[PDB]
Short mmCIF file of C-alpha atoms and ligand atoms in Angstrom, two decimals:
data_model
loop_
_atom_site.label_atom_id
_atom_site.label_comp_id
_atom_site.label_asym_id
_atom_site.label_seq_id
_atom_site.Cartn_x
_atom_site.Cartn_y
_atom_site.Cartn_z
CA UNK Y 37 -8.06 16.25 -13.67
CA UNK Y 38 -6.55 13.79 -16.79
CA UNK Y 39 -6.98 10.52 -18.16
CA UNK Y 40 -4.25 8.05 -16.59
CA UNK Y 41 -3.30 5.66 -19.02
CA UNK Y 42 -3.51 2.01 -18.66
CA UNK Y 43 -1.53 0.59 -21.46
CA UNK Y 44 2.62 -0.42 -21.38
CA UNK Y 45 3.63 1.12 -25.01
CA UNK Y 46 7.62 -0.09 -24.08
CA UNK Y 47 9.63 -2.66 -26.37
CA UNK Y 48 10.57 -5.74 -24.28
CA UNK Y 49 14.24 -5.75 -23.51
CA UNK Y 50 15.96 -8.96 -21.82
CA UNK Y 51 19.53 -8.64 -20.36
CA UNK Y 52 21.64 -11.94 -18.67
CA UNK Y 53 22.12 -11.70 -14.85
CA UNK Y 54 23.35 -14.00 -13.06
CA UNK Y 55 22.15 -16.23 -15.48
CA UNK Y 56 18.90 -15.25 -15.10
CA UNK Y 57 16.64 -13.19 -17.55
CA UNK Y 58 15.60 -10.06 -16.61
CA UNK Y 59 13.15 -7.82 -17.98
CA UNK Y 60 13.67 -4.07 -18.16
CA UNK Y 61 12.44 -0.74 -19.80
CA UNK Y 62 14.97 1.43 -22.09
CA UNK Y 63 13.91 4.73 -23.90
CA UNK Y 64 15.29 7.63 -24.38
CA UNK Y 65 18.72 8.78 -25.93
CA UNK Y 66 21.64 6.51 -26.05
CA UNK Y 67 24.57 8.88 -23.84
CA UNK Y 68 23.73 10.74 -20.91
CA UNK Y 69 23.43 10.15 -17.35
CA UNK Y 70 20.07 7.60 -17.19
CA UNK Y 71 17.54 7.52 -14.77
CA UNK Y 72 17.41 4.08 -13.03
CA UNK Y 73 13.31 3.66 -11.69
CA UNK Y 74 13.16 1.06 -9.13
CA UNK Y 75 9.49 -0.45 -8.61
CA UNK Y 76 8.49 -2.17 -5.11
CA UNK Y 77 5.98 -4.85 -4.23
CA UNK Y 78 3.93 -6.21 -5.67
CA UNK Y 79 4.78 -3.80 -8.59
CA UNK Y 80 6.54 -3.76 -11.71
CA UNK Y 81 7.87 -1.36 -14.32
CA UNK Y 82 4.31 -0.77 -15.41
CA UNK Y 83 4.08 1.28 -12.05
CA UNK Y 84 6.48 3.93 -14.03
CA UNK Y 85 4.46 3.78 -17.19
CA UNK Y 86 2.70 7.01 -16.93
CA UNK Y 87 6.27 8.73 -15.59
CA UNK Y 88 9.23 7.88 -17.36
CA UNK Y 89 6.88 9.85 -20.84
CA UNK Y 90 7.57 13.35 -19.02
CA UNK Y 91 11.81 12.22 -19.25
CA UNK Y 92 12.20 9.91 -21.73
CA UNK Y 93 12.21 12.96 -24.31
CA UNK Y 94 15.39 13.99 -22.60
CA UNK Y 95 17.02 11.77 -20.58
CA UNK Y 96 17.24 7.81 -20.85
CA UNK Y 97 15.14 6.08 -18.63
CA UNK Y 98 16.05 2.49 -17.55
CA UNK Y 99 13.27 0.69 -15.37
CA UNK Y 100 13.83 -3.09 -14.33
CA UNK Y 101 11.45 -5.73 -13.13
CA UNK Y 102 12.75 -7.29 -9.99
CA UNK Y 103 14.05 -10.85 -10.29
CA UNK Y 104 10.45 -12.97 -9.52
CA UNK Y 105 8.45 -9.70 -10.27
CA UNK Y 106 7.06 -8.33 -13.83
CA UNK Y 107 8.67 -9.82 -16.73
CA UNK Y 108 11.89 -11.28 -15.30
CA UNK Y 109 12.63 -14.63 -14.68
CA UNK Y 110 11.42 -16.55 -11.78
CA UNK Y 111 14.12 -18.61 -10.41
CA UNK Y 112 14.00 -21.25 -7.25
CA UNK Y 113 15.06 -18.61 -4.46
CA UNK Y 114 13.84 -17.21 -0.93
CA UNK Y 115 13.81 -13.82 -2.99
CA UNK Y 116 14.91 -12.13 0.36
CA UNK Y 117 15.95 -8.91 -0.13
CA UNK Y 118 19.68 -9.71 -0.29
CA UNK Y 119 18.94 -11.73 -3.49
CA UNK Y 120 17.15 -8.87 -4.78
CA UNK Y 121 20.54 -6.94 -3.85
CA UNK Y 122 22.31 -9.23 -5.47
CA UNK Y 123 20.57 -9.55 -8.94
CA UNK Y 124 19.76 -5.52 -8.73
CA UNK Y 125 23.67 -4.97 -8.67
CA UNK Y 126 24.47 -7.25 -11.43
CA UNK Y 127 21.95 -5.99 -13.69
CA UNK Y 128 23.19 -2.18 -13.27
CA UNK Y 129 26.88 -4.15 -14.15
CA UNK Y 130 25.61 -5.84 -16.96
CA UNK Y 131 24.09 -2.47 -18.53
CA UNK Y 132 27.31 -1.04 -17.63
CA UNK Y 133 25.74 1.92 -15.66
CA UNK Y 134 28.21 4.21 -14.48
CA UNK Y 135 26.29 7.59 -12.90
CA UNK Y 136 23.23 7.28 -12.51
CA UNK Y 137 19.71 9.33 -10.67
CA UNK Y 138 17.73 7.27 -8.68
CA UNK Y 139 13.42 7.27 -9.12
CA UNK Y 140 12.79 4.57 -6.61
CA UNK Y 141 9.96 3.62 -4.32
CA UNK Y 142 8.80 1.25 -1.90
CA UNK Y 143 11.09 -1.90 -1.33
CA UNK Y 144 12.66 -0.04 -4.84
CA UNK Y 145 14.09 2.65 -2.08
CA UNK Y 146 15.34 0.26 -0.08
CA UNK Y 147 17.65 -1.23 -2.90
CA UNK Y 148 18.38 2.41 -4.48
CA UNK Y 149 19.25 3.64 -1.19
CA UNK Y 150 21.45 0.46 -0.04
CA UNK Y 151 23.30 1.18 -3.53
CA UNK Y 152 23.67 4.30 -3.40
CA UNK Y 153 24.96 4.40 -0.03
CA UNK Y 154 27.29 1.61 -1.26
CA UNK Y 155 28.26 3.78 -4.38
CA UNK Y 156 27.96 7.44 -3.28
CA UNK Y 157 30.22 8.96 -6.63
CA UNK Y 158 27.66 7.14 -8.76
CA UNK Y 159 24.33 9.01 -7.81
CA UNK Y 160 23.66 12.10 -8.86
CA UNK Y 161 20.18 12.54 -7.24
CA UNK Y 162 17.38 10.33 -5.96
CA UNK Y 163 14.00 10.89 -6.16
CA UNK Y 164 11.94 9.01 -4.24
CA UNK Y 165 8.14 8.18 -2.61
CA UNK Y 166 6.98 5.47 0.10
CA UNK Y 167 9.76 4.10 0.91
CA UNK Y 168 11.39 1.81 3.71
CA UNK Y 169 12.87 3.18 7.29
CA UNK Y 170 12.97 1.70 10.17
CA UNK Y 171 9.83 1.12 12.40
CA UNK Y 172 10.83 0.97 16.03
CA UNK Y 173 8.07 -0.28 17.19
CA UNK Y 174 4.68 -2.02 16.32
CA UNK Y 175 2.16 0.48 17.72
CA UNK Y 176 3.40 2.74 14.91
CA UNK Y 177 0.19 1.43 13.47
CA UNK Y 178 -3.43 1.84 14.37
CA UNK Y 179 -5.08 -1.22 15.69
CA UNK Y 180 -8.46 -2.70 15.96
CA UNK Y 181 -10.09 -0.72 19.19
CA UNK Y 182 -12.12 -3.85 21.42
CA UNK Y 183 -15.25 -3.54 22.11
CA UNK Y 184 -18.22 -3.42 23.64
CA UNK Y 185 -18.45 -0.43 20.98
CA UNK Y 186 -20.76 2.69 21.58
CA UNK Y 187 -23.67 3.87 19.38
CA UNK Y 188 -26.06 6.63 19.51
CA UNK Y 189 -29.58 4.92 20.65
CA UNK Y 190 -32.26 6.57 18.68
CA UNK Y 191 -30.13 6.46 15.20
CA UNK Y 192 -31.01 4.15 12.99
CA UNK Y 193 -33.41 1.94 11.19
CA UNK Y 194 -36.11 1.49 13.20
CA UNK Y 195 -37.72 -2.24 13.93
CA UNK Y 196 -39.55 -1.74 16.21
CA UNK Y 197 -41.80 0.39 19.20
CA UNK Y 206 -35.84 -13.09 22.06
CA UNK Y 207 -38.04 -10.81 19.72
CA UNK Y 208 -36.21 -7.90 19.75
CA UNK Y 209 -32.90 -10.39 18.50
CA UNK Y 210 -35.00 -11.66 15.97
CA UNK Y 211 -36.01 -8.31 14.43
CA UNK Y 212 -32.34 -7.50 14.23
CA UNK Y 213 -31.17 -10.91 12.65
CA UNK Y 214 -33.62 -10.68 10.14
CA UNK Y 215 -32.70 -7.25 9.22
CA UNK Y 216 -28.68 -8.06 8.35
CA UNK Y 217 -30.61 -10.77 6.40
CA UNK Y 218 -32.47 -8.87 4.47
CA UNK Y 219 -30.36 -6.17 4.08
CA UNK Y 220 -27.72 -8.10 2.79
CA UNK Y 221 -24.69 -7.57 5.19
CA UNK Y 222 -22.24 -10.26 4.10
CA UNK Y 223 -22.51 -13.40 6.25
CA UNK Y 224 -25.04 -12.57 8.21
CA UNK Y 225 -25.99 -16.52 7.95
CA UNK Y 226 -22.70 -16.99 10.61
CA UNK Y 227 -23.87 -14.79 13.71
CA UNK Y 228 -26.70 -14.84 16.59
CA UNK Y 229 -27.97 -11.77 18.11
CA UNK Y 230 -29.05 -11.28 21.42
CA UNK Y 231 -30.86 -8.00 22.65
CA UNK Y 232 -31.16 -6.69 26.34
CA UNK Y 233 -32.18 -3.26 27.00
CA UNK Y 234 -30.52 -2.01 24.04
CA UNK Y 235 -27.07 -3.91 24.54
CA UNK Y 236 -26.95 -6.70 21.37
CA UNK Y 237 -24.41 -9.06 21.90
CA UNK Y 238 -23.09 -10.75 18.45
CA UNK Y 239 -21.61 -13.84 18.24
CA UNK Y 240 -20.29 -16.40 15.92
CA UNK Y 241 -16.97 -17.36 14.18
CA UNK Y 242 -15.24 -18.02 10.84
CA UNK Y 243 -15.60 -14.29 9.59
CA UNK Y 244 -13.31 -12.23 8.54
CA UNK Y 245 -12.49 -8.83 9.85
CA UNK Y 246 -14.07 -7.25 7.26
CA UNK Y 247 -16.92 -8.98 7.58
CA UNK Y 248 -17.17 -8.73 11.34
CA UNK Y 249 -16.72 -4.92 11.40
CA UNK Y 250 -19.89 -4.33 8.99
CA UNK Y 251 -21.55 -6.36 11.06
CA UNK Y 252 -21.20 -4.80 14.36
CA UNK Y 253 -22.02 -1.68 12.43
CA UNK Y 254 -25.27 -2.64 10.98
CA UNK Y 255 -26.44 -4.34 14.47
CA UNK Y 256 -25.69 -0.74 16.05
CA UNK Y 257 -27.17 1.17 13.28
CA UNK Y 258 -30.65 -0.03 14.67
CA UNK Y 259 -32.79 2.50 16.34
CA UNK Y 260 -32.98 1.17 19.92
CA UNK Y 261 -29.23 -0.27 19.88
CA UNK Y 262 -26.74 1.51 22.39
CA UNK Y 263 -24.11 -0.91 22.29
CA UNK Y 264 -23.08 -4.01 20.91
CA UNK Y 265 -21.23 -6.50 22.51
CA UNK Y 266 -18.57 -8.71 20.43
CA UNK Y 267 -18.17 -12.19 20.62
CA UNK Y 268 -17.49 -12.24 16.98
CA UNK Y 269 -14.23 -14.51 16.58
CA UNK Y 270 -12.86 -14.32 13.21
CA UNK Y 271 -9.47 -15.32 11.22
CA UNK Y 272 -6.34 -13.81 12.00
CA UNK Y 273 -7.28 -10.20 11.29
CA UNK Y 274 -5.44 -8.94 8.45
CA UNK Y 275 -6.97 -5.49 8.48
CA UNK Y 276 -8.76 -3.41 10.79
CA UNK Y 277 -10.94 0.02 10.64
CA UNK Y 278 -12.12 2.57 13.37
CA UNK Y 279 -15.93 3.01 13.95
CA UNK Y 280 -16.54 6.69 12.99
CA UNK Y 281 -20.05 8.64 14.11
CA UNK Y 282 -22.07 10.92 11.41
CA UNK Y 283 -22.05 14.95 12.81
CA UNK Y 284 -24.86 16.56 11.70
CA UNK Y 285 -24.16 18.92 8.21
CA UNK Y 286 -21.35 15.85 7.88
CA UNK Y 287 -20.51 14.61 4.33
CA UNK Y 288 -18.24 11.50 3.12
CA UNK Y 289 -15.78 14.51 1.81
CA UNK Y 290 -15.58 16.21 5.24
CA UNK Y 291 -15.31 12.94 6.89
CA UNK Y 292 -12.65 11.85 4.75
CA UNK Y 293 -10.78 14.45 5.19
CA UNK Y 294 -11.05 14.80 9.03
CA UNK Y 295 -10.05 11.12 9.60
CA UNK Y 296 -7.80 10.59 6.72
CA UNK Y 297 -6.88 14.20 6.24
CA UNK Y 298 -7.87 14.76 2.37
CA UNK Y 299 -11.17 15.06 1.24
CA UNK Y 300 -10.76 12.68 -1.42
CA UNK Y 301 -10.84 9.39 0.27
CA UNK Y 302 -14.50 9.85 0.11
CA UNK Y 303 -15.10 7.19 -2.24
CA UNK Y 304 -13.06 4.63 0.09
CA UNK Y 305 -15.56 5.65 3.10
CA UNK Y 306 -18.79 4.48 0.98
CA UNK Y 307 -17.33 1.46 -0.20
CA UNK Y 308 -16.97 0.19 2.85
CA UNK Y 309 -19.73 0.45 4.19
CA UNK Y 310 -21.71 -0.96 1.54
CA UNK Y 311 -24.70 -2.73 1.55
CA UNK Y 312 -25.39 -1.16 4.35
CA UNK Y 313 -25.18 2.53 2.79
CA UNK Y 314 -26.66 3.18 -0.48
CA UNK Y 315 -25.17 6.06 -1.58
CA UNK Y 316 -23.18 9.06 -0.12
CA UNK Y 317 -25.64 11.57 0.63
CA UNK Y 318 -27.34 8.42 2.36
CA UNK Y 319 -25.46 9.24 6.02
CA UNK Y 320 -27.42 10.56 8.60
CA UNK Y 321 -26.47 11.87 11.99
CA UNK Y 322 -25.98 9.59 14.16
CA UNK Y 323 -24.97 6.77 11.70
CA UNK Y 324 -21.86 4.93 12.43
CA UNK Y 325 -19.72 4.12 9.60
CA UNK Y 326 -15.96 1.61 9.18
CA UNK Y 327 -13.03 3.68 7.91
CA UNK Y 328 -10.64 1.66 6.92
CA UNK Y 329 -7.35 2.36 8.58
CA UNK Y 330 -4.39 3.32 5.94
CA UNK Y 331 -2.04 1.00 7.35
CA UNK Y 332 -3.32 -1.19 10.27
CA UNK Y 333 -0.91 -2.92 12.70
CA UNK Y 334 -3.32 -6.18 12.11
CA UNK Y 335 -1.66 -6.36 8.44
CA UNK Y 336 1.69 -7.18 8.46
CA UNK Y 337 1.57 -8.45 12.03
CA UNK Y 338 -0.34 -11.43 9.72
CA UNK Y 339 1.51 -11.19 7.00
CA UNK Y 340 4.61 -11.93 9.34
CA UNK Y 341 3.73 -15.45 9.93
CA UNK Y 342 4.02 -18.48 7.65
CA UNK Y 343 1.07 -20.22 8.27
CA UNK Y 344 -1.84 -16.85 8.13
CA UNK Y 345 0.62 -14.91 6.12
CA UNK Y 346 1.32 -17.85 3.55
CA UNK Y 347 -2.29 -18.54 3.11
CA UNK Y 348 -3.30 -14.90 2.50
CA UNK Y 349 -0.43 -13.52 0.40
CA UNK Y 350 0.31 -16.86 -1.52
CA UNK Y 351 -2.93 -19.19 -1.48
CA UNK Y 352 -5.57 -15.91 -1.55
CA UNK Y 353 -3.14 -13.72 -3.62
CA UNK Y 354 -3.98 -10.73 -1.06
CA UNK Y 355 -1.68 -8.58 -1.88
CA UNK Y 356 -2.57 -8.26 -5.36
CA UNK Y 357 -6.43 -8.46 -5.11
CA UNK Y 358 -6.48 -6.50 -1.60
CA UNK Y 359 -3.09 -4.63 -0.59
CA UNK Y 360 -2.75 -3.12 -3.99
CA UNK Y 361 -5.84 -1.57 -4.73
CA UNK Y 362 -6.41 -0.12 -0.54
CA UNK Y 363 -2.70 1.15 -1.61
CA UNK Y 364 -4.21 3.48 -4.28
CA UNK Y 365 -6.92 6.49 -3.88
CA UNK Y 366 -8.87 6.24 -7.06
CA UNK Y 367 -10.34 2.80 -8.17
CA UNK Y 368 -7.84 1.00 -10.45
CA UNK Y 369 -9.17 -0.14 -13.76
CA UNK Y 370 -9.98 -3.96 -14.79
CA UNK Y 371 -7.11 -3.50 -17.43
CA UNK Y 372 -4.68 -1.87 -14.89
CA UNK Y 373 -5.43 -5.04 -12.26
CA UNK Y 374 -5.05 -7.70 -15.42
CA UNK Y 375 -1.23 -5.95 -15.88
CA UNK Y 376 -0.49 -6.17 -12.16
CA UNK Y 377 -2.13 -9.56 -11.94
CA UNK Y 378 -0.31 -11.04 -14.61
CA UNK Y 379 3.22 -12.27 -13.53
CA UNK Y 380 1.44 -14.00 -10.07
CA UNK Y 381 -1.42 -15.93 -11.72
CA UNK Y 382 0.21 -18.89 -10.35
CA UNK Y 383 0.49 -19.12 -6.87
CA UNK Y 384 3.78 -20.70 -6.80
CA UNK Y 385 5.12 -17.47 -8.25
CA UNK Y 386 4.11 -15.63 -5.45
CA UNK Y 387 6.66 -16.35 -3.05
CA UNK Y 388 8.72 -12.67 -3.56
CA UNK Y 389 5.36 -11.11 -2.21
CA UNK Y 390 5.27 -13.35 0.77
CA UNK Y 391 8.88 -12.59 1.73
CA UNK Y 392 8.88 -8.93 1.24
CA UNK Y 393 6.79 -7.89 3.87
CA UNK Y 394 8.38 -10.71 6.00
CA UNK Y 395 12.19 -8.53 5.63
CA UNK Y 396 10.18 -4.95 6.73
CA UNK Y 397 12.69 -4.19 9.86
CA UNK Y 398 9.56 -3.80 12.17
CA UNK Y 399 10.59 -3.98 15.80
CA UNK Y 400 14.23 -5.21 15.59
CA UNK Y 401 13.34 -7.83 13.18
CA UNK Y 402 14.89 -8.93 11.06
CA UNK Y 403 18.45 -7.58 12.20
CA UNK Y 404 20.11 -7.75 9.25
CA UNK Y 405 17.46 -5.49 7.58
CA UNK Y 406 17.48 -3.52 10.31
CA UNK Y 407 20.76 -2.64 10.46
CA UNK Y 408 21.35 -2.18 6.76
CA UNK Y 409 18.22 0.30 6.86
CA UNK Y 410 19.48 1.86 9.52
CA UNK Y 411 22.55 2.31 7.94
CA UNK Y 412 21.55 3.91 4.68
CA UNK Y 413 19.23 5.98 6.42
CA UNK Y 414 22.34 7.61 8.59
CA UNK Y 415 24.18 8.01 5.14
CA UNK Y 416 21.00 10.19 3.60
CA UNK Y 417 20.80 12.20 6.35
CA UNK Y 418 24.27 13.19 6.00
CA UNK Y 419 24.63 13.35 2.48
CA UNK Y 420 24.48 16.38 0.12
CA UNK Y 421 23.24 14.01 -2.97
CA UNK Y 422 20.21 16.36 -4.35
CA UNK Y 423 16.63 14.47 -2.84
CA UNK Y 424 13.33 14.74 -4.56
CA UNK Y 425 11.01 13.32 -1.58
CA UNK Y 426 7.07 12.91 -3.32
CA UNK Y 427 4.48 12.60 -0.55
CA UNK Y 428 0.68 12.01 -0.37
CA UNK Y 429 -2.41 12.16 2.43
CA UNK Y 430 -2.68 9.76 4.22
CA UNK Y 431 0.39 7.81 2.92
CA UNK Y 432 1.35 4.22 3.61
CA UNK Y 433 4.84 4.24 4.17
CA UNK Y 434 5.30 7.68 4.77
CA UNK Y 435 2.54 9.99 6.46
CA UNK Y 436 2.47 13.54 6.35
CA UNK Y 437 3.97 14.30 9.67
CA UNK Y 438 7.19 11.87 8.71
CA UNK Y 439 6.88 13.40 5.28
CA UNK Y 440 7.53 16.82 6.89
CA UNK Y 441 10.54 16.13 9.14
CA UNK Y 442 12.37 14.46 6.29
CA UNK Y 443 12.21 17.44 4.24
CA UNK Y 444 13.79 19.17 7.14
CA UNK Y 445 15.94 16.57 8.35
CA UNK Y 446 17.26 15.49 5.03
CA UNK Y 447 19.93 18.26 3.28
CA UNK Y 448 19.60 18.95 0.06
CA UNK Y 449 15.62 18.39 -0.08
CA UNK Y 450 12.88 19.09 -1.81
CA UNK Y 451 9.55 17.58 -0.84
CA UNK Y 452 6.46 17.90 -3.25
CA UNK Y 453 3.01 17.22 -1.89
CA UNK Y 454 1.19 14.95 -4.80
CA UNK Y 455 -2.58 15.61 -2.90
CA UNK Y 456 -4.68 12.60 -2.02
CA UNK Y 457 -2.15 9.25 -1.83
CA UNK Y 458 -1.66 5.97 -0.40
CA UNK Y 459 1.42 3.77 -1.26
CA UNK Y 460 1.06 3.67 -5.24
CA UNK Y 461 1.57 7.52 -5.41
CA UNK Y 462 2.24 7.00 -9.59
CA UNK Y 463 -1.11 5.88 -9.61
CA UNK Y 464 -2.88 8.76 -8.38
CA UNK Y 465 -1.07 11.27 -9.71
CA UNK Y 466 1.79 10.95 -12.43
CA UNK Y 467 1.43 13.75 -14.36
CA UNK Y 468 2.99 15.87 -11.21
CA UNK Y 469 5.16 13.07 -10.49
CA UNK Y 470 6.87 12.76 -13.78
CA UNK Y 471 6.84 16.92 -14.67
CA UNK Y 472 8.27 17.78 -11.13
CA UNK Y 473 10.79 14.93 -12.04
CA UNK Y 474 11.68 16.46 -15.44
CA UNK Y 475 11.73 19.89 -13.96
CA UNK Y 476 14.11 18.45 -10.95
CA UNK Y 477 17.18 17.26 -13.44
CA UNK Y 478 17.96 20.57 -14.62
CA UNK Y 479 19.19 21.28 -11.13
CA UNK Y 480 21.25 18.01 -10.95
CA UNK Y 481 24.68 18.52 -12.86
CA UNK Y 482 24.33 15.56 -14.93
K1 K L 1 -28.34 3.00 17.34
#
């Protein structure tokens, strides 16, 4: 219940690797054992901005950009994740780091842990959030159920006692649903059939819903063909005495999604207390298998990530509960304004080990993950509902599985946990190191 602070009140600091300039965060005193914050993608240090205040009285707090990412140069590389090994271990060399605690998250983990697994005297505790294990296999994630999809006949608008398409055309028209212009409707004894193509998934899905929130309408059948999908909801139906709270927190299992539930279904709802019973609704899946299996490619996943920017303008914000700020999007926006920057956010989720691939990820993953589970370095796992990454039911056997654990719940959270709640983040942190022996 605070303000969260947009603004990046660190000096610039610059260090030689590789002979490369990279950019990096330094406060705190001079001496002790430093905390080394490792951002992900398509982050930078200004992820930690709102953290490293509750240690920096104390402790030193070093927090680099990633070579490509933030501040830091932006050489001609494949910025796979070995190169990020590569420029991640010389920079810890050139600050001449000797112990060290870990705050790392997302593909931040996977270099923190790969270190620290390479370097076990030199870690003296990791705390970390989201980050990368192996996926086994693909239906890990939810996918887009086919149709012909179900709605309750009598709910809806009503437009009425080839006309009864018309009626319905005219009403995604009118009402505004977003290309409307690229679909026919046919109607047959309350089965609509909607067709057309060149839509996107997003686009499609409010579609369908709008055609079946028609009074009249049992089912609609989809010959919508769109784009590669590169997200995907599920169709959800009002209860009576529902709200958007107690549907968010049924579906996504915290109340305070509820915001993300009207969004997307906007034009079509007005405002929350709008729903009726009856009504279906999109909720957006957390993490659909339609995303990275597009991402994965390089002719979809090239044009969304690098020509559309996607990750930046769409990833980022679904990967954070409350509504990021204009200012906040301007600072992550920054280092990727031109597209040919944007390669590191192309390749990242191109080396997630996802089904085997790709091996060497896989087995170097794999690898650090049997070293944590056997190790007794101290573990400060932060977790968040729904999660990304990390859901609440993985959350919970970690803290079990891993020795030496202790797992904080950070409420309502999707991958950019610091964004949605730092303040328990960055005290649970400072509260954490007095336990360390540092
Ligand atoms: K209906």
């Amino acid at each position: 219940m605070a303000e969260i602070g947009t603004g990046f009140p660190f000096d610039p600091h610059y260090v030689e690797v590789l002979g490369e300039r990279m950019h990096y965060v330094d406060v705190g005193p001079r001496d002790g054992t430093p905390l080394l914050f490792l951002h992900g993608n398509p982050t930078s240090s200004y992820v930690w901005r709102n953290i490293i205040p509750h240690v920096a009285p104390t402790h030193r707090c070093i927090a680099p950009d990633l070579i490509g990412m933030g501040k830091s140069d932006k050489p001609d590389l494949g910025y796979f994740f070995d190169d990020h090994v590569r420029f991640m271990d010389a920079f810890i060399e050139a600050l001449g780091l000797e112990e060290v605690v870990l705050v790392i998250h997302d593909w931040g983990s996977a270099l923190g842990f790969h270190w620290a697994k390479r370097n076990p005297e030199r870690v003296k505790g990791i705390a970390f959030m989201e980050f990368i294990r192996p996926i086994p296999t693909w239906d890990e994630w939810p996918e887009f159920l086919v149709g012909p999809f179900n709605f309750v006949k009598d709910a809806g608008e009503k437009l009425w006692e080839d006309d009864l398409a018309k009626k319905v055309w005219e009403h995604l028209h009118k009402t505004g649903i977003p290309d409307a212009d690229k679909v026919n409707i046919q109607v047959a004894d309350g089965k609509a059939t909607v067709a057309g193509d060149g839509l996107s998934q997003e686009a499609k899905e409010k579609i369908l819903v709008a055609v079946g929130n028609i009074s009249g309408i049992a089912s609609v059948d989809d010959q919508v063909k769109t784009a590669t999908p590169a997200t995907a909801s599920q169709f959800y139906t009002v209860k009576s005495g529902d709200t958007l709270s107690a549907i968010s927190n049924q579906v996504y299992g915290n109340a305070d999604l509820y915001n993300k539930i009207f969004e997307a279904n906007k034009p079509m709802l007005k405002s929350p207390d709008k729903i009726y019973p009856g009504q279906a609704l999109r909720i957006p899946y957390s993490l659909a298998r339609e995303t990275f299996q597009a991402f994965r490619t390089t002719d979809v996943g090239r044009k969304l990530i690098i020509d559309q920017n996607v990750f930046i303008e769409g990833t980022l914000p679904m990967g954070v509960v409350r509504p990021l700020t204009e200012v906040e999007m301007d600072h992550y926006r920054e280092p990727f304004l031109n597209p040919v920057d944007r390669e590191p956010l192309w390749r990242f989720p191109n080396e997630l080990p996802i089904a085997g691939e790709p091996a060497n990820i896989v087995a170097l993953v794999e690898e650090y993950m049997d070293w944590l589970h056997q190790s007794p370095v101290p573990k400060l796992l932060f977790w968040g509902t729904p999660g990304v990454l990390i859901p609440p039911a993985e959350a919970a056997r970690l803290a079990k599985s891993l020795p030496n654990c202790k797992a904080v719940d950070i409420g309502p959270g999707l991958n950019l946990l610091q964004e949605d709640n730092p303040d328990l983040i960055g005290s649970e942190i400072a509260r954490w190191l007095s336990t360390l022996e540092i």
